[PDB]
Amino acid sequence: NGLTGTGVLTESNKKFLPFQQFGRDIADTTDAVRDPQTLEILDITPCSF
Amino acid sequence: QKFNGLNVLPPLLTDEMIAQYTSALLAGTITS
């Protein structure tokens, strides 16, 4: 959805509202995204450093 | 670890061995 990022995609146990697409934390960074083709929610984990 | 380049490092002394020092000091005080 126009957001470009790099990370590892994993399935999520959280449930969004059917109108929100982006998951954010208190630190205000993107960590959960809804796939545009199929309706599911995925967590993003930065690869190790 | 953390989000953007931040990193936290563990202390050299485990809390268990800290408690061990405290116990040794207390035993020395109460005995000698």
Q: Rounded to whole angstroms, how far apart are CA atoms A16 and A13? A: 10
Three-class DSSP category at B28: helix
Tokens of A25: 């934390």
Method used to determine the 3D structure: cryo-EM
Q: Rounded to whole angstroms, how far apart are CA atoms B20 and B14? A: 10
Number of separate helices (H) and strands (E) present in chain A: 0, 4
CA distance A17 to chain B (A): 26
Three-class DSSP category at B31: helix
Q: List the Cα angle A26/A10/B8 in 5-degree steps.
A: 50
Question: A41-45 and A22-24: which strand pairing?
Answer: unpaired
Residue appearing with tokens 């059917």: A18
Measured CB to CB, residues of chain A less than 8 Å from chain B are 27, 29, 46, 49
Give chain A positions within 8 Å (CB) of B1.
Answer: 49
Tokens of A28: 């205000």
Three-class DSSP category at A30: strand
**Taking phi first (over 0 means left), then psi (-120 to 50 degrees means alpha), and beta for anything else, what does residue B26 get?**
alpha
**Taking phi first (over 0 means left), then psi (-120 to 50 degrees means alpha), and beta for anything else, what does residue B30 get?**
alpha
